[PDB]
Symmetry: D4
Subunit: 150 residues, 8 copies
Amino acid sequence: MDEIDLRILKILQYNAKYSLDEIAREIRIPKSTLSYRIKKLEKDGVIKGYYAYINPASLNLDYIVITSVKAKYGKNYHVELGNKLAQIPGVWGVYFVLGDNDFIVMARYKTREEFMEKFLERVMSIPEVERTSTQVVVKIIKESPNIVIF
Amino acid sequence: MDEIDLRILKILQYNAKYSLDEIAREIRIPKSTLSYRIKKLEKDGVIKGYYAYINPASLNLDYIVITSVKAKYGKNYHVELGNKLAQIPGVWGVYFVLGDNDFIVMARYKTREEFMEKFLERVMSIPEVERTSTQVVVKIIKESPNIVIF
Amino acid sequence: MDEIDLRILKILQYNAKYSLDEIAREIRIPKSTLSYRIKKLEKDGVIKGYYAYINPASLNLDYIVITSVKAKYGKNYHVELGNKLAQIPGVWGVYFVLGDNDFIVMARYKTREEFMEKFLERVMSIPEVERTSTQVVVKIIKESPNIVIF
Amino acid sequence: MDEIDLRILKILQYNAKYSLDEIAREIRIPKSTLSYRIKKLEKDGVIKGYYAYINPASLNLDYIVITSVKAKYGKNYHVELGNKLAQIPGVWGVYFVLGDNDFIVMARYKTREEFMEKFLERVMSIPEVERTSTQVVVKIIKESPNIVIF
Amino acid sequence: MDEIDLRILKILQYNAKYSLDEIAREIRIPKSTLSYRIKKLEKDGVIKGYYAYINPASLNLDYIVITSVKAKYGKNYHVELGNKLAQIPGVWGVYFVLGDNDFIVMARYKTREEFMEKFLERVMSIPEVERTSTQVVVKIIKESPNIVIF
Amino acid sequence: MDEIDLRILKILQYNAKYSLDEIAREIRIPKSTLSYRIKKLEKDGVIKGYYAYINPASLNLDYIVITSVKAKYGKNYHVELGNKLAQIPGVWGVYFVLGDNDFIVMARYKTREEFMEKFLERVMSIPEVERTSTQVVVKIIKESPNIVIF
Amino acid sequence: MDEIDLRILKILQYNAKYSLDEIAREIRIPKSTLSYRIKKLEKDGVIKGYYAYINPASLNLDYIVITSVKAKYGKNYHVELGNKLAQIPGVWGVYFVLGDNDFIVMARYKTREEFMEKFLERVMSIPEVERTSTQVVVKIIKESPNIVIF
Amino acid sequence: MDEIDLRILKILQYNAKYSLDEIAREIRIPKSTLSYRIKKLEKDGVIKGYYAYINPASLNLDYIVITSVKAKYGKNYHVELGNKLAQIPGVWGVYFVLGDNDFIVMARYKTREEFMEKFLERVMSIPEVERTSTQVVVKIIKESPNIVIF
Ligand SMILES: NC(=O)CC[C@H](N)C(=O)O
Ligand SMILES: NC(=O)CC[C@H](N)C(=O)O
Ligand SMILES: NC(=O)CC[C@H](N)C(=O)O
Ligand SMILES: NC(=O)CC[C@H](N)C(=O)O
Ligand SMILES: NC(=O)CC[C@H](N)C(=O)O
Ligand SMILES: NC(=O)CC[C@H](N)C(=O)O
Ligand SMILES: NC(=O)CC[C@H](N)C(=O)O
Ligand SMILES: NC(=O)CC[C@H](N)C(=O)O
Ligand SMILES: [Mg+2]
Ligand SMILES: [Mg+2]
Ligand SMILES: [Mg+2]
Ligand SMILES: [Mg+2]
C-alpha cells in the first residue's frame, strides 16, 4: 500500500460508516478510485472487517480483569494452555509475553460472581497452571485498540 | 434495551456492514423496526461508533508491548501520570489496576527503535514514575476487543 | 430496610445492650415500633446475632498472625484447601483474594509454640499447599470488625 | 480469671443475649454468682462491650479489600501513617506486621466507586506512602473475629 | 538467677579465662561465693560450655554465605529438610523463619570450589527443596554471637 | 600454623577449659610444647579470646529476628548505615551481602515489645533506610558459630 | 555479503590466524579472491577487528559478577547512568533490557576485595541508582561471544 | 608470567594482527624474545586462540536476549539442564549464579520468530525447568568481552 491507502485507513479506523463521497472529498481522489483502493485493502487482508464499537458499560460489564498465568514446562503444556485460556467466555485477549514469560489474559464480566464462575473457577481447575495473578481494573484511562495509525 | 437489542448487537459486534435486510431476516423483525432500534442504540450511547478492523501486521506493527508503570504517591501524581501515558503515540490502552496498584499500558510500534524513541525514552523522562516493567508480546493468541457478547 | 433501620443498626453495632427506652429516645420513634423493627431485622438475617467483645489480650492472645497461602492448581484443590484452613483452631478469618490469587488467613494464638503446634505444623503437612508467608502482627492500630456503618 | 470465667466467655462470644437463667443452668452455678462474675469481667476490661453482628451483605458491602501499605522511613512517618489509615471511613482493621514490615489494612465498601473515592484516592494523596497493594476479596470462607475461645 | 549472676555472665560472655580473684574483685563478692554461683549456672544449663573464639580468616574461611531454602509441603518434608541442612559440613546455623516461611542457613567455606562441592551440590540433589537463594557475604560489619547481655 | 595447631584448635573450639594434660595426651605432644603453641596462636590473633557459651533461653531471649535492610544510594549512606545497625542493643550480627545487595542483621530480644522499642522503632527513624524485612525465627535447628573446624 | 562471505566469517570467528592458503582450500576459491573479500568485510565494518582470546583464569579473574542496576526516573538519569557503569574498570558488558527495565552489567575481578573497591563501592556512591542486585557467577558453562554463526 | 607478558597481552586483547616489529618497538624487547614469549603464552593456555570480531548487526542479529532459567531440584537436574542450554543454537553464554541461584543464558537471534523457534520453544519443552524470565536487550551500551586487562 501507499501513502494514499494510509490516509484512507486513518479515516476508516475511526469511522467505518463515512460515505465514499465524503472520504473522496477529504483525501482528494475520485470516488471510484477510492472504492477500488478500499476493495483491494479488504482483499489483501489489510482491512479484516468492520465492527460496531459497543460501550461495555451499556452491557453492565463492570468487572474488568487482566490476569497473568504461568504454565508448567514440558510436553506441549504452554501452547495448549494458551488455547484453553482463549476459549473462555469473556476473554478477549490472550498474549504470551517475555519478561514474566507467561500469558496475559484480558477479560470482561458483569460481576464478581460471573468472573468467578466463568473464569477463575475454570482456570483453577487446569492442572498445568503454575500460578495466576488477577489485576482488577478500577479505571480505564484509555481503550482504543481500533487506533493503529496515530 | 431488551433481548432483541442484544441479538442485534451480537451481530453488529462482528459485522457492521451487514445490510438491514439480512439482519432483519436473521432476527425476524421488520426492517423499519430494526432501523429504529439501531438508531436508538446509537442515540443512547450503546453503539459508540463503527470502526474498520485493520490488521496490525499489515502496518508492520511488529513490536507489541504491555508495560506496568508505578507512580509516586502524593499530590495528584497518579491521575496526572495516567493522562501523560495516554497521550503517547502508539499507546492504545491505559488501565489502573488493583493488585499491583499501578498502570498497565498497551502499545504497538513498528520496531524496537520506534518503541524506544516514542515510548520508553518519553516515560524514562517523567520524574513521578517510580518503576516500569515492559513485557514484550511475542505471540498474540487472541485479540478481539470488539467481542462484548459471547 | 430504610433510613430508620440504619440509625438503629448504627447504635446496635456499638452497644447491643442499650435498652429499648434509650434507643427509642435517641431515634424518636415508639418503643413498640423499635422492638418491631429490630425483630424484623433479626428475622430477615440483617442482624445475625449478638456477641460479647472479649479483649484478646485478656486471654493472653499475644501471637497474632496473617498468613498468605497459595494452593496447587487442578482438581478441586483450591476449594478444599480453603475449608481445611478454616477448620484450624485459632483461625478466625479465611479469605480468597485477587492480586496474589491466594488465601489470606487471620489467626490468634497465646504463644509462638501454640502457633507452631496448632497452625504452622498443620499447614506444613498439607500437600496441596504450594507456598505460605506468615506476617507477624506486632501492632494492632485498629480492629473493629463490628463497625459496618461509619 | 478462672476456668469458670472461661466457660462463661465461651458462651458470651457466641450469644450475648442468653439469659442468666440459661447460662447458670449450662455452667452449673448460682445465677447471682454468674451475674457477679460477668460484672467483674466487664469491670476488669475482659469483656469490652456487646455488639450486634450485622450481615455486611445486607448493607450491600460488596467491595471487600485487604491492602498492604509501605511507609517512608525517617522522622515519625510510620506511626503517623498508621493513624491516618485508621481514620479512613470503611477501614475496620489496621495492623503493622513483620515479614513485609508494613501495614495491612482491612476495609469494606459498597462499590468500586466508593472504594476509589473514600479509600484509594485518599491514600494515593499521602506523600509518605511508598507502595500499596490492594487484594480484592472475592470469597469470604470464614470471618468470625468474635471467636476467641475455640 | 539474680542480678549478681547477670553481672557474672556479663563478664564471662567476653572473657572465660578471667581468674576468680579478678571477677570477685570486680563484682564485690567472696571468691568462694563466686565459684559456687558459677558452678550452679553450669549445673542449671545457663552456661552451656566455654569455647575458644577462633578467627575465621586465620583458617582462610573467605567464602561466607547465607542461604534461604524453601521446602516442599506435605508429609514431614519440612522437619526432615532442616535436619539434612544442619548435617552439612561448614553449616553452623540453621533457622526456620516466618515471613518467607523457610530456612535460613549460615555457612563458611575456604573457597567457592569448597562451597560448591560441600554445600551447593549437596543441596541441589535434595528433591524436597523447592527453591534456594544464596547471599554471598562480602563484609562482616559485626559478628559477636557470644554477646547475650548488652 | 600446621596440622598440629589444627588439632589443638579443633578441641579448643568445643572446650576451652580442657587442661593442658588432657589435650597433651589426646594429641600426643609435650605439655610444654602445647602451652607454647597455644600462646603463639593467641599472639598471632588466631585465637581471639575465650567466651562462655550462655543459653539464650536462660536469659528469656525468646524473640529472635533476622532483618534485611536496604540502604539509599549515594554519599556514604551504605557504610554509615551498617555502623548504625551494629550499635543497636540486641544486635549481634551485621553482614552486607550480594544477591539482595543489602544488610542482614541478626538480633535477639526478650519480647516483641523489647524488639519494637530497641530495634524496629530505632531503624524506622533512620531516613537513609529504603526498606526492611524482618524474619521471625520460630525454630533454631542449629546455632554453633564456634565451630570453625568440621 | 553473500553465502561465501558467511563461510569465510564462520572460519574467522574461530581462528583468525588461519593462512589464506588453508581457507582458500577449505572454501574453494582463489586465494586472491579470498584476500579481496576479507579486505572488503573489514572495510565495510563487518569484521571489526581481531583479538587474542585470553583465558581469564590465567589472569586470576576469579570473582565474576552479573549485576542488575535500576535507575531513577526523570531528567537524563538513565542514559547518564549507563555511561557511568561502562567506564568502571573490570566492566566489559552493559546492557539495558526490558522486563526488569534496567541495566545488566557484566564484570570480572581477581578477588572480592577488588570487586568491592573497583565496582560496588563506586556504584554505591551514585545517587541516581535506585537498586542493585549482584549475582555471583560460580560456574561458567559456556562463554563464547565470538561465535556469531552457528 | 611477568609484567612483560601482561604488556604483550594488553596489546593482543585489542589487536591480534599487530606485527612482531610493531609490538617489539612498543614494549622495548627483541622481536625474537617477543615471539618466544607469545609462543609460550599459547603453549601454557594463557592465549586460547585468536578470533575475528564480527559485528552482530552485520549479521542482522537484532533480537538479543538474556534469560534466567530456574531448575528443578534433585537427581542431576541442575547440571544436566546447564548442558542442554549450552547446546542451543544462538546461545553463547551460560552461567550458574548465586543470589537467584539459577542459570543466566545469553543468546542472539535475527528475529523474534527465530528466537521463539530456536530458543524459547526448545526451553519450554524441557520438564526440569521450573521458571524462565527473558530480558530483551534494547541497547548495548558496551560489549567488549575481549578486554581482560584494563
Ligand atoms: N469523484 C467522485 O467523487 C465521483 C465521480 C468520479 N468520476 C468517480 O468516479 O469517482
Ligand atoms: N420487513 C422488511 O424487511 C421490510 C419491509 C417492512 N414492512 C419494514 O418496513 O421493515
Ligand atoms: N414510646 C415508648 O418508648 C413507649 C410507649 C409507646 N406507646 C410504645 O409502645 O412504644
Ligand atoms: N440459681 C439460680 O439460677 C437463681 C437462684 C440462686 N439462689 C441465685 O441467686 O443465683
Ligand atoms: N574473697 C576472696 O576473693 C577469697 C577469700 C574469701 N574468704 C572466699 O572464700 O571467697
Ligand atoms: N608431657 C607432659 O604432658 C608434661 C611433661 C613434659 N616434659 C612437658 O614439659 O610437656
Ligand atoms: N588459488 C590460490 O590459492 C592462489 C593462486 C590463485 N591464482 C590466486 O591468486 O588466488
Ligand atoms: N629486535 C628486533 O625487533 C629484531 C632483531 C632482534 N635481534 C631480534 O631477534 O628480535
Ligand atoms: Mg474495531
Ligand atoms: Mg461483633
Ligand atoms: Mg562462644
Ligand atoms: Mg575475542
